[PDB]
Scaffold this active site. Structure first.
Site, PDB file in Angstrom:
ATOM      1  N   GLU A  33      46.452  -1.609 -14.416  1.00  0.00           N
ATOM      2  CA  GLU A  33      47.358  -0.626 -15.033  1.00  0.00           C
ATOM      3  C   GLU A  33      48.285   0.128 -14.070  1.00  0.00           C
ATOM      4  O   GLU A  33      49.422   0.452 -14.429  1.00  0.00           O
ATOM      5  CB  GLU A  33      46.648   0.357 -15.989  1.00  0.00           C
ATOM      6  CG  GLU A  33      45.730   1.358 -15.252  1.00  0.00           C
ATOM      7  CD  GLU A  33      44.411   0.773 -14.812  1.00  0.00           C
ATOM      8  OE1 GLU A  33      43.429   1.453 -14.616  1.00  0.00           O
ATOM      9  OE2 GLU A  33      44.423  -0.529 -14.656  1.00  0.00           O
ATOM     10  N   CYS A  47      37.145  -1.742 -14.163  1.00  0.00           N
ATOM     11  CA  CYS A  47      36.105  -0.993 -13.442  1.00  0.00           C
ATOM     12  C   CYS A  47      34.791  -0.848 -14.218  1.00  0.00           C
ATOM     13  O   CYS A  47      34.038  -1.802 -14.441  1.00  0.00           O
ATOM     14  CB  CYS A  47      36.627   0.418 -13.108  1.00  0.00           C
ATOM     15  SG  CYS A  47      36.214   1.019 -11.447  1.00  0.00           S
ATOM     16  N   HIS A  82      42.435  -1.496 -10.930  1.00  0.00           N
ATOM     17  CA  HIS A  82      43.198  -0.922 -12.012  1.00  0.00           C
ATOM     18  C   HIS A  82      44.551  -1.589 -12.095  1.00  0.00           C
ATOM     19  O   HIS A  82      45.517  -1.119 -11.502  1.00  0.00           O
ATOM     20  CB  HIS A  82      43.359   0.590 -11.823  1.00  0.00           C
ATOM     21  CG  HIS A  82      42.037   1.294 -11.857  1.00  0.00           C
ATOM     22  ND1 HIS A  82      41.568   1.932 -13.004  1.00  0.00           N
ATOM     23  CD2 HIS A  82      41.095   1.434 -10.884  1.00  0.00           C
ATOM     24  CE1 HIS A  82      40.379   2.450 -12.709  1.00  0.00           C
ATOM     25  NE2 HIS A  82      40.065   2.154 -11.447  1.00  0.00           N
TER      26      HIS A  82
END
Ligand SMILES: [Mg+2]
Ligand SMILES: [Mg+2]
Ligand SMILES: [Mg+2]
Ligand SMILES: [Mg+2]
Ligand SMILES: [Mg+2]
Ligand SMILES: [Mg+2]
Lengths: 536, 534, 534
Positions: free
Chosen positions: A508, A379, A506
């Site tokens: 993650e 991001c 993301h």
């Protein structure tokens, strides 16, 4: 399939590992072939965590469906296969929010709206709604048994238990059992007093997970069982571990699942914790070691980057690399120089919002790029990367994003609605949740991902300015992945670097210890490679 | 002289070091020239502490007046100069026991006897009686707030405060503030829950002593100060220290006494902590070290010999020697033999009752005596030595103490009554302070540098005077005696570097500030030995 | 025979009629053929009720076994046939007293004695001991939930339940449900608060007995049932009735026993309440009425003569006479004279101790005897009469009882020991059931229709046998005697309509169901008089 509930509460202290402990227990049960889920009831007025500050709250997790949520949902997903949805998390404020609408709109019929039953009723509805068709549902009550804020949640789950009955409901309570240096021993008092509060409000715990410095000795446990408390052999020891991957195993060692299956009358195969042992093994036996620099503006609260840090760890797992994460502040960079970044086998720029540490980030990106140091940006971190280049490898004079400099000649990043030219020319908002994304043939990620298409999760507004794109492209930069519609740019890569990728999403929120993440795995390997050439 | 009361309570968990903390606070106040005392209210049904096991409770402290009390009075005594009496310690049992009997003798006149007001009235009576004309009285409430056991004490002090008013009453509450290795943060919830248990009982704390493994940060504090607590800057941090001698200073640094004095309107000089500072310095700067073996039976729970350990530590202080206490179980001497005694610069045989390791000890005494190892025996430790001596030197076949072998022919230890002889020939309990006379040409006479001393007693069995002369003859020295029955108090072993054994408990008078002649002398010797022996 | 326990507690306020309600429930169960008992746990430090004042506690009930107890055992006895023993009543004081002594005799072995588990263990022991092989045991906990006084009892029964399990344990909790004249509605909050005090203590009630001045409406009930309470249809209403004899029926109507039996898995016939029904009927349908004067000293607190009053009521029942009890203070007889005695169909002189109105009584006895007014004297009331008789007839100048005038020449009442004579010439306490022999040509012989009877005693002073013959001669009749020392039990006054006086306490055996011969006979006579006398 009568749905069974396990209400998970904590006593004595907060920060007991309740989220993780529920997750772990859920993991075991799944490992027994059960259809399991977990939910988080947050005792706070904020209507959604999507507004809580990272400092204080920690990271804002994002579910497939775009709910902004408590980070515990992150733990859930990394332990079980069930996907989380908005149904898996609600706060005291959304309830009230709810009850206040129904009210101001009749529903109550000039009746007097009270906590009981109006509020509690609202809590149960949501709890049922999320347990909906699961064999076992783990209901984690946030806060500490004893706070008022908790009250309505506890009363509601009490009501449920009565209603549903001992045969399909359990109470799992977590307590602190301090170790005394002075006493040179185990203090059970605090648990007793905690169990005491449960009773005071209708609740008799069925199971006790005793958190201690070290394993709680039967004798102590035996004391608690009877000592007030009144549980049987359902008194569990949950010592401090060096690896959460070991929890499912420890709990199992103690019979927690069995106890639970029996109570629930669940006939089912013994838990096979193979994947967990695998993870543990891998972790225990790294081959190499790297040091990765995480450069951001929220380092006060490492929990602000919970998911990233776990992802890095996963990447290490998949490569047998022991990753050393070095948390660095965007600021100092644009303050203390660049000598803070030196000695990193790799560099990561996470997300965030502001313009606050932003300058140091741009820097970091530039440093990484220029010093052929493997870099990964999420991001903000992509943005700060689009810039540096825009700036340093193209014209994009003072390249920026309208989040920081609303009026820049070169707004390479900014709201789609704000897309203008360098000459202010123009053309003929919150991206949340899972979204398909089309990868560019011949790109690094296309290889890493080993698929044309992928699905990642978003949490952003500011997009890459298509208006100034080719301009940056032709500067050498490459677009690795897009998202149809407006073909928005999702992933970029810098061609003449060892390992340089950046994405809007993301990655993650999709990483897990068992299955890793292609992007992180790559990044980590690269970090290794880099370490390897720097000395040999 | 309006007496001022400081009610000291504890929450969350037991073992917060509440006794020491109260002592230390008393120490500051005293250092401001205040007339201070401290009392221990133990919420237990045992009527007399002098019957509880050490396993559980640890050493039995003995006051000047012969009262047998909770070990905490020992702490009190090592921090303040005010002496303790039977009136500084009492239990629930004593209270009920009192009320029961009062009731049986119709003092209540057919009225209903109840917890409130009968029991509480009884408690208040004792408190006032103990605080009788002192500027400040620290009343330490045993047990943990929130338990049933301490209810009466808490209700009683609530009344006092209410009766007496906030001008002369303060509540000081200790609490656990855990550290989360996880979040790396400090948990103040337990304090809150604990503070709330007080409220539920009608008490609102004035000061909080926050116990942690590290200092509680102003942050976590101001939170406490207000959030759920409501005290001013009466939130004090009390981190785990390496020396309790540091405590008064630590508390003083945070202004506890000023706050205290201020509330009570006490105008007094600043706390002069010089003595404490010295102690601290001496302790930190030992010039040598030693290993003293402590050979006994209750060797298991340390608190069993609280005062002894402390007096050995004080011995170090006085000699700038670092004392390594080797806790040695006498049965293993019995079991494995003098092998264990190897590696000591000194031997200490404490008191106690129960044949148990008794043989293990006699041995030790011998060992020590025969290897010219400095020795110190207290009570039983003295008896155990009379024996060895008598035996192995006076040749008294199996000399003993009726206490263990009533049928012994040769019983040098025994009640004045059982006092017989080897020929069967012939012709209560000692507690508290007793004058004892030191023998003119004794070592012990030098050490104390006095003709007569005062020591504390707690024993029944005695030196069988009918056999004394035999041992005297065999070489043994009578270093001191009671007086009247001229009971043997201390004995010495002449061909020894340092061999002393007394009946009384010297440890009850040891103090970090003023030390103790025996202990001092004993440690010195241990040093000397150490060196020599190399 | 797995024993079943019903724990009876009370909340909100004291005086909810918890004893009667427990009795009444016991009465239903018994009427289902169950083997039932009841016990009273009094949270008071007095060791023996036999020392409390009536001002406070009311009459001292006496059991068969001589135990002196709480008046509640009297209630128990008037509702069930199971007899009470010393084991059906005990206080906090007895418990502590027990533990203290056990502790002093080293039973605890130096271990710490505490409320938990020592006291609670002691309580449990007594409970089990009292419920020993009965199908159902009602354990009534004295005091009000939420008070400090009853904590131990509550903790103990909590354990039992936990130990024993819900198959043989139930908690029954009485509570006040006030009526708001205002809103004209019924307040269930107090119940909620009360129920919550139990929870805070770890007890969750199974049944609620809702006491109001009128029946608690299903409305207010189902609310209770759930809202803050959590019981099933164990919410029972117990309105203020006009006759306690109605209670078992009222409870039975609401299904309490069924719920009870159901829970305990007791398969038994329906409660046969026929006897209760009869009693109810008789009480409601008197055919005449009377006024019986009750002349005494503790005349103030009614409960002082609980059993007597009840036995007079039972007298009415048996004769379908409505008994008007006129409570008359003896000092006023003393004060204003026999003027007060005017308007009685009968005179009753109860027992008691304390010279006080003693003269006021003797008078009365006389009055009654001299105006041919039926009289009944119990204990003191009998003594008071021996006197009058002896005096005014045997001409014994100031005859008396050493109890009040040890120096009397003429002392017809006194300890067997003080037994002298008018010439100074010569030659512990009675408690419990005693056989007494009825004299062949006695009134009392007829009434009891037996040679020997059993009655309850509670007295020291006796009929001075050395003077008996004098009075016998003077006309007096010895209607009954102890046996061995052949102590005088009952006396009669021959030229009288109805004059009886006994040593024992007939009232302790009276029952609404079976009445009592003396009382019956006495009431009858009062009627007769009434009529005649007009
Ligand atoms: Mg959590
Ligand atoms: Mg929360
Ligand atoms: Mg203490
Ligand atoms: Mg204590
Ligand atoms: Mg009662
Ligand atoms: Mg009572």
């Amino acid at each position: 399939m009568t749905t069974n509930y396990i209400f998970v509460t904590g006593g004595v202290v907060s920060s007991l590992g309740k989220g993780i402990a529920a997750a772990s227990l859920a993991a075991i049960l799944e490992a027994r072939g059960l259809n399991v889920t977990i939910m988080k009831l947050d005792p706070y007025i904020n209507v959604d965590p999507g507004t809580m500050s990272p400092i204080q709250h920690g990271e804002v997790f994002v579910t497939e469906d775009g709910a902004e949520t408590d980070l515990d949902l992150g733990h859930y997903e990394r332990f079980i296969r069930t996907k989380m949805s908005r149904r898996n998390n609600f706060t005291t404020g959304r309830i009230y929010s709810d009850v206040l609408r129904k009210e101001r709109r009749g529903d109550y019929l000039g009746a007097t709206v009270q906590v009981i039953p109006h509020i509690t009723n609202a809590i149960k509805e949501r709890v049922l709604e999320g347990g909906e068709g699961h064999d076992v549902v783990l209901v984690e009550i946030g806060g500490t048994v004893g706070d008022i804020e908790s009250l309505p949640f506890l009363e509601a789950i009490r009501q449920m238990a009565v209603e549903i009955g001992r045969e399909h409901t359990l109470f799992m309570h977590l307590t602190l059992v301090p170790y005394m240096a002075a006493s040179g021993e185990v203090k059970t008092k605090p648990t007793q007093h905690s169990v005491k509060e449960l009773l005071s409000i209708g609740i008799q715990p069925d199971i006790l997970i005793c958190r201690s410095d070290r394993a709680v000795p039967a004798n102590e446990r035996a004391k608690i069982a009877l000592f007030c408390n009144v549980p049987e052999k359902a008194v569990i020891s949950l010592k401090d571990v060096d690896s959460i991957y070991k929890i499912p195993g420890l709990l199992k060692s103690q019979g927690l699942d069995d106890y639970i299956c029996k109570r629930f009358s669940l006939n089912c195969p013994e838990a096979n914790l193979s994947e967990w042992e695998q993870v543990i093994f891998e972790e225990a036996n790294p081959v190499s070691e790297v040091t990765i620099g995480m450069v951001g503006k929220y380092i006060e609260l490492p929990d602000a980057y919970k998911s990233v840090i776990e992802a890095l760890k996963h990447g290490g797992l998949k490569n047998r690399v022991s990753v050393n994460i070095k948390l660095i502040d965007s600021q100092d960079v644009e303050t203390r120089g660049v000598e803070i970044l030196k000695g990193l086998d790799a560099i990561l720029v996470p997300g965030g919002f502001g313009y606050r540490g932003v300058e140091g980030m741009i820097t970091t990106a530039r440093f990484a790029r220029e010093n052929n140091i493997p870099y990964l940006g999420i991001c903000l971190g992509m943005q700060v990367a689009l810039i540096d280049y825009a700036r340093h490898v193209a014209n994009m004079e003072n390249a920026n994003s309208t989040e920081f400099v609303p009026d820049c000649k070169y707004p390479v990043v900014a709201l789609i609605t704000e897309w203008r030219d360098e000459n202010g020319n123009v053309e003929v908002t919150m991206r949340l949740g899972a979204q398909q994304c089309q990868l560019v043939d011949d790109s690094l990620v296309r290889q890493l991902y080993n698929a044309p298409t992928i699905v990642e999760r978003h949490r952003h507004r500011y997009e890459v300015n298509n208006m100034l794109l080719k301009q940056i492209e032709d500067a050498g930069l490459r677009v690795a992945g897009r998202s149809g519609d407006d073909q928005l740019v999702e992933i970029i890569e810098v061609p003449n670097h060892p390992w340089f990728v950046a994405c809007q999403f993301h990655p993650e929120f999709t990483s897990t210890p068992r299955d890793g993440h292609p992007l992180f795995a790559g990044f980590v390997k690269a970090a290794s490679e880099f370490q390897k050439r720097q000395a040999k």
